[PDB]
């Protein structure tokens, strides 16, 4: 119940489902809580639809 995408990573290695989902809400909230850290963080939802197939 920590890193939940890593929690879903445990439910694949024991071979019961072969579909992970890397959505955008786990990226924008990853950037929402990276708003307060004043460092250079490039946009992520741009490049994954500027050119999607390199992701």
């Amino acid at each position: 119940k920590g890193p939940k995408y890593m929690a879903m990573l445990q439910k694949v290695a024991n071979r019961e489902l072969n579909s992970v989902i890397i959505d955008l809400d786990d990226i924008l909230q990853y950037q929402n809580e990276k708003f307060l850290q004043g460092t250079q963080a490039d946009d992520l939802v741009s490049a994954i639809q500027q050119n999607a197939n390199h992701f």
Binding site: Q50, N51, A52, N53, H54
Partner: protein
């Protein structure tokens, strides 16, 4: 390029006064594209150089554009691209031309060819009937080496640069450049463009009849795709161009032409001989011409200035042509919001005269003539391979009838194929077929205009008024108004007829077509709780006086009695269903039924 550039250079300082009036226009169109897109929570690059402003103070720079237009267009691009960033670059696609003006006798109808102005400018009009596919095409990809993390850059030219004779590059993806890096390519950072082949016929009226209509074809680009419906009076102008190798290929190319004439062009213009602009003046006159209590009667007799009378007919055409609305049911079948009238008459009584002058004021309603062929509302899987390996359902005559009107003749004088064809497409708004391909429910809002003749001479009074032509009464039930044109002899009638055929060998039409194509876009009342009360009294009597008279009626005839008065208020241009509309709808049926 030293000597072939100085006159290009001299133009770059010359025409900056020609866009003294357009240097605002080039930047004002893109600052809101930098403001719509930056504040979402859209226009192409079109720069209309008038030919006058270039002709007004340049001759040598002007004369080359109508003699050798093959060295002179990427000049005017090259000045134009650097006067976009130097205007606007701070916010972080070559702006090609459109080139409108006059031309001075280059209206070559493509029945005629050129012998002298090959590879020159040319203005061409006509109708299109081909409308082939749409398909993207690259111009430039951007290679990338994953190892050492650095990109590459390569352009692939084709027969789309329009003027230079480039060495072709028939490579699809040149991989493994001079390194040991397995190459990648960011296709989102690549760039693409599309093509569309369309053939244009001849306008078959100013071509004198010694030949069938000929045709040539034109390849256009991204700005003006999906603009031309099949059946539009289009006007295009571009360069003239031959391509391909022919006659001197490797061997045995005897008596084979090898110069495909093409047109790479711009500025596709519709014409009308939807674009009708109007100022405050003429839009207020029609408000002043909405004022009288007689305008339904004035507009009736101001339509066909050759034939006497038939004011029941003359009101019906203008009532039908403007048309009525169809409120589509939410999660329910919409009803027949169209209207479909019918005529029949003893012969040579102008029953076919008035059917073709509606086509001049049609407002994009091109009709057929009713020839005994399957294709009235279908395709029958005509593909012609769509350039080697694609199957398309090319529409016969329902891609044109949508929100328009059609008219066909000789209903009884047909075979059985059209009888089942007009069966479905009347009770149902659409058609669906998998002839050799896929089912597809393409829609069409259309309305017929009929014409037929009785078989047994002058027998419309001595026999049954019904069962009179014995075409299947499913269509008679699906139509409403069956006018029987009388031609009895009155000694003052024919005497008045005899002079009106003499005074025709020598309130107006363009104001009339502007009125309806403005009144097709305004409000729809549908509601008055007492105008709906008078009509049900106006029906239930004749619902009890239908079998005791000549014609029996049905329940769907009630949907006519709203629909006629619905468009009758559209003539008034008012948001209220009045009372006076329930009197014209009464007596118009009373003439159609008595």
């Amino acid at each position: 390029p030293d000597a072939v550039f100085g006159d290009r250079v001299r133009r770059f300082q010359e025409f900056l006064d020609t866009f003294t009036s357009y240097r605002d226009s080039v930047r004002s169109i893109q600052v809101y594209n930098s403001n719509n897109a930056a504040n979402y929570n859209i226009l192409p690059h079109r720069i209309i150089i008038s030919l006058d402003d270039l002709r007004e103070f340049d001759r040598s720079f002007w004369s080359g554009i109508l003699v050798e237009p093959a060295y002179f267009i990427p000049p005017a691009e090259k000045a134009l691209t650097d006067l976009a960033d130097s205007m606007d670059d701070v916010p972080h696609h070559p702006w090609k031309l459109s080139f409108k003006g006059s031309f001075g006798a280059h209206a070559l109808s493509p029945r005629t060819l050129t012998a002298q102005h090959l590879n020159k400018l040319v203005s061409v009009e006509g109708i299109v009937t081909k409308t082939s596919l749409v398909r993207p095409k690259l111009i430039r990809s951007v290679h990338y080496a994953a190892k050492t993390g650095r990109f590459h850059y390569r352009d692939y030219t084709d027969a789309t640069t329009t003027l230079t004779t480039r060495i072709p590059t028939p490579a699809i993806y040149p991989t493994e450049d001079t390194e040991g890096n397995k190459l990648t390519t960011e296709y989102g950072y690549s760039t693409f463009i599309d093509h569309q082949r369309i053939t244009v016929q001849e306008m078959p009226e100013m071509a004198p009849a010694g030949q069938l209509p000929r045709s040539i074809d034109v390849i256009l680009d991204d700005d003006l795709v999906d603009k031309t419906k099949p059946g539009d009076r289009v006007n295009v102008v571009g360069v003239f161009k031959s391509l391909g190798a022919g006659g001197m290929n490797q061997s045995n190319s005897n008596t084979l032409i090898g110069f495909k004439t093409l047109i790479l062009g711009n500025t596709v213009y519709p014409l009308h001989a939807a674009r009708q602009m109007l100022t405050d003046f003429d839009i207020r006159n029609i408000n002043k011409l909405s004022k009288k209590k007689d305008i339904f009667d004035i507009l009736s007799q101001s339509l066909a200035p050759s034939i006497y009378g038939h004011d029941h007919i003359k009101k019906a055409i203008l009532l039908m042509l403007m048309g009525g609305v169809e409120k589509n049911l939410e999660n329910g079948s919409h009803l027949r919001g169209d209207i479909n009238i019918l005529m029949v008459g003893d012969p040579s009584t102008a029953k076919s005269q008035l059917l073709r002058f509606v086509l001049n004021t049609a407002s994009l309603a091109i009709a057929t003539t009713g020839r005994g062929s399957s294709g009235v509302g279908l395709t029958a899987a005509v593909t012609t391979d769509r350039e080697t390996g694609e199957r398309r359902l090319e529409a016969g005559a329902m891609v044109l009838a949508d929100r328009g009107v059609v008219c066909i003749d000789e209903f009884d004088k047909m075979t059985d194929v059209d009888r089942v064809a007009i069966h479905e497409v009347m009770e149902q708004q659409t058609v669906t077929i998998a002839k050799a391909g896929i089912h597809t429910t393409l829609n069409a809002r259309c309305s017929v205009i009929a014409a037929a003749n009785p078989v047994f001479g002058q027998y419309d009074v001595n026999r049954d008024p019904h069962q009179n032509i014995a075409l299947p009464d499913s269509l008679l039930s699906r139509f409403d108004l069956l006018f029987v044109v009388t031609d009895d002899i009155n000694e003052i009638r024919d005497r008045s007829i005899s002079e009106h055929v003499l005074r025709t060998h020598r309130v107006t039409i363009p104001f009339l077509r502007k009125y309806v194509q403005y009144a097709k876009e305004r409000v729809i009342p549908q509601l008055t709780q007492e105008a709906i009360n008078v009509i049900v009294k106006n029906y239930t009597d004749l619902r009890n006086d239908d079998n005791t008279k000549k014609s029996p009626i049905t329940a769907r005839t009630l949907e006519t009695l709203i629909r006629l008065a619905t468009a009758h208020a559209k003539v008034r241009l008012s948001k209220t269903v009045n009372k006076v509309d329930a009197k014209v709808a009464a007596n118009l049926l009373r003439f159609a039924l008595l």
